[PDB]
């Protein structure tokens, strides 16, 4: 107790040095994150202008689509396998690991690999997100300044690694809060005390978000408008939807885990069968990117279209299954780049579908499907990644429909609740586990 | 410890269904409780106005029943606290914070009636005090009481239902779900060691609470501020400045509240009757101020939209800030039942507004609205005096829906905590918990 009294009186006194260096990490991650994003766009762009150069010979343009992305794919699968293997998949598990002191931050290897590796997979139009990549990049960015400036101490190593990861999700979504909240909900050591200064992570998130804004202002990644409010007599439908995400989450989770296994057979561990296989996936993604663009790429493009109910019911069901397919294929392949963001599209689509049904079952509720799209947008995040506070807050920061907070929070819990009750797990904790298991075996 | 972690990682987020269900119960009661507390406080402030109209001609008589009404209810509240539950004086947040450290008892049989009826006295009197503390402590004990009744066992359950209590507690106070949840996991939970507090469960509690408040309070916001103008990048540096301003003020304010506790203690020395009398004097001053200068008394939620909208002269903004600082200290440092959290929103708004004023005239190249600076400054005393910036930013966001100001709100907030740290200041709740924990041994 007299310990506590002495501790209370000492609370929130983050070492100025830790604070100042947070500012620099955030800034470096911001620029980096910005740089990564523009990079991706540019290459998605060239692949479009090359389909223009050959826009008459249909079997040929199908080819240059495939190849342009297939090649770009390969450069990434290669860049990871050869120089930094810890930069396959998301990279959140990896940095999550790092915060436990159970995996290594080889920044001199991963910064170039993840950044350029990510440039190829994403820029090739593969179904993966910049989040994991930017969270990882940001962690290593923060690690690198720790090293360079030779900051000593557990607190400095934990905090600077943390602000980098928050700054990087911030910068990838224009979600300063979601960034901060991710580190406190999910990313930090879940099972024991740690000295991570919240105020220092904040300071990093700002500089990160600010960089993003210098280069990306007057446009937002998702615009959805202002949707209707949600009647209290309407809320129970949001508990049902959360239950549907809650049973699905774990199933989807298994599938990403198992497809990891099954795709690993195709190459056995071999860098050449891998990159070859990788390029076939990546070439299929640049192919899909032309014949049916909603089945491929990041998926952000169809969130707004879906929310405004501008899809038929079939089109929705198509998009949902077509994207369950190409999400597992892309992420369980090993390719650098996350599953977080492509879940946003997955959830939005599922929700909208559920919205469509409500609208005709209950004309008395004066429903808009787009409200269920918004409740569902971070619902997969809640059921599979099991960070619903960060999901909810992210979607909020991304869609500005704050009057939907009750529906979103209800579907949120409805997902985490039923995900737990059907014995699913935190996917990023299942993956870090899967990786510490092969490490001591 | 690699092997332990692989085990732990795979067992993560598996909250006992008992705790989950009980969180829902705690939620629901905390909600009804807070709704009641709010409807109660309103009804009294009201009859008190019905009183003044009953005598709207004889000004000296009207200035009198203004005083006595608030004086009587003040006393009744001070009295309930000294006599039956002394740990229901002040905010209630340091206490429930203490409870999470297992260093202060949750005497729910005593505090539930004392805080609820004593707060109803002081708030209903029109004293300058928050509902936040009160409903946070009320909710904590509601939490404890369902723990006792259902005889749940295990640390998880205790801390959890305690945490869920205070979180659903704050959420119902403000219609602010995210802000409640966040307050638990930023400021409320134990700061220097690990704990097992299901976030999932606090979430379930918070939902139920917020839903209950929505049953009885739909369609009318605590604060309507409408949509304001955006902030240009080249304007952000002006928020960092305002942050710094709060950051030096934060700790200064803190000292006054603590010192004023000491100064006010000498007026009674501990004596229940001197104390109660002093409360009735204070209370009456407030109910008088409520008639003659309403912006200097009461909770302040009213003058928030006005300030943001630019309808106050700088003269008024200065008058309000000084006089409200003054009566905020008088009321909270006196140890009546009731918080300092909510009236720190008003103090901030005004201060922010004031800065927006001077900002607007100094920089017409910016096309400023003084109201963006008010909204920046709302969560700012929360950041500089309480050092819970992430809660204040999110709280205000929930309360004002101006998301396009997230960057300046954040920036002003960090500014506040940074300068509050640097200028040698401490979190107000923690420094009150410690003051009380230290006095526990001193004698």
From Swiss-Prot, chain A:
Motif Selectivity filter part_1, chain ranges: 89-93
GO CC aspect terms: plasma membrane
Catalytic activity: 2 chloride(in) + H(+)(out) = 2 chloride(out) + H(+)(in)
Residue numbers on the Periplasmic membrane side: 53-59, 216-235, 293-312, 360-369
Binding site residues for chloride: 90, 339-340, 428
Keyword Transport: yes
Site (Mediates proton transfer from the outer aqueous phase to the interior of the protein): 131
A GO biological process held by the record: proton transmembrane transport
Transmembrane segments: 16-52, 60-83, 107-124, 131-149, 198-215, 236-264, 271-292, 313-332, 338-359, 405-421
Record protein name field: H(+)/Cl(-) exchange transporter ClcA
Species assigned in the record: Escherichia coli (strain K12)
């Amino acid at each position: 107790r007299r310990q506590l009294i002495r501790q209370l009186l000492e609370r929130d006194k983050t070492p100025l040095a830790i604070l100042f260096m947070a500012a620099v990490v955030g800034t470096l991650v911001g620029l980096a994150a910005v740089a990564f994003d523009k990079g991706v766009a540019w290459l998605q762009n060239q692949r479009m202008g090359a389909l223009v150069h050959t826009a008459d010979n249909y079997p040929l343009l199908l080819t240059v689509a495939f190849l342009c992305s297939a090649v770009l794919a390969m450069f990434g699968y290669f860049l990871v396998r050869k120089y930094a293997p810890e930069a396959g998949g998301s990279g959140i598990p990896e940095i999550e690991g790092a915060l436990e002191d159970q995996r290594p931050v080889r920044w001199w290897r991963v910064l170039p690999v993840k950044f350029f590796g990510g440039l190829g997979t994403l820029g090739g139009g593969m179904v993966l997100g910049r989040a994991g990549p930017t969270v990882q990049i940001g962690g290593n960015i923060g690690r690198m300044v720790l090293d360079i400036f030779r900051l000593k101490g557990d607190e400095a190593r934990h905090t600077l690694l943390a602000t980098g990861a928050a700054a990087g999700l911030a910068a990838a979504f224009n979600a300063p809060l979601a960034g901060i909240l991710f580190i406190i909900e999910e990313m930090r050591p879940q099972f024991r005390y740690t000295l991570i200064s919240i105020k220092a992570v904040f300071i990093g998130v700002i500089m990160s978000t600010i960089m993003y804004r210098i280069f990306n202002h007057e446009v937002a990644l998702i615009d959805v408008g202002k949707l209707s409010d949600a009647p209290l007599n309407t809320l129970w439908l949001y508990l049902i939807l959360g239950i549907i995400f809650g049973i699905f989450g774990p199933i989807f989770n298994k599938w990403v885990l198992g497809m990891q296994d099954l795709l690993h057979r195709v190459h056995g561990g071999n860098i050449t069968k891998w990159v070859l296989m990788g390029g076939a996936i990546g070439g299929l993604c640049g192919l899909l990117g032309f014949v049916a663009p909603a089945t491929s790429g990041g998926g952000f493009n169809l969130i707004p279209i879906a929310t405004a109910g501008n899809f038929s019911m079939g089109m929705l069901v198509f998009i949902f299954v077509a994207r369950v397919i190409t999400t597992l294929l892309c992420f369980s392949s090993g390719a650098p780049g996350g599953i977080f963001a492509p879940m946003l599209a997955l959830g939005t689509v599922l929700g909208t579908a559920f919205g469509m049904v409500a609208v005709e079952l209950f004309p008395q509720y004066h429903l808009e499907a787009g409200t269920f799209a918004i409740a569902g947008m971070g619902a997969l995040l809640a059921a599979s990644i099991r960070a619903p506070l960060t999901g909810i807050i992210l979607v909020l920061e991304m869609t500005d429909n704050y009057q939907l907070i009750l529906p979103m929070i209800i579907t949120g819990l409805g997902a985490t609740l039923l995900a737990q009750f059907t014995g699913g797990k935190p996917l990023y904790s299942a993956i870090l586990a899967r990786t510490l298991a092969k490490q001591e075996a």
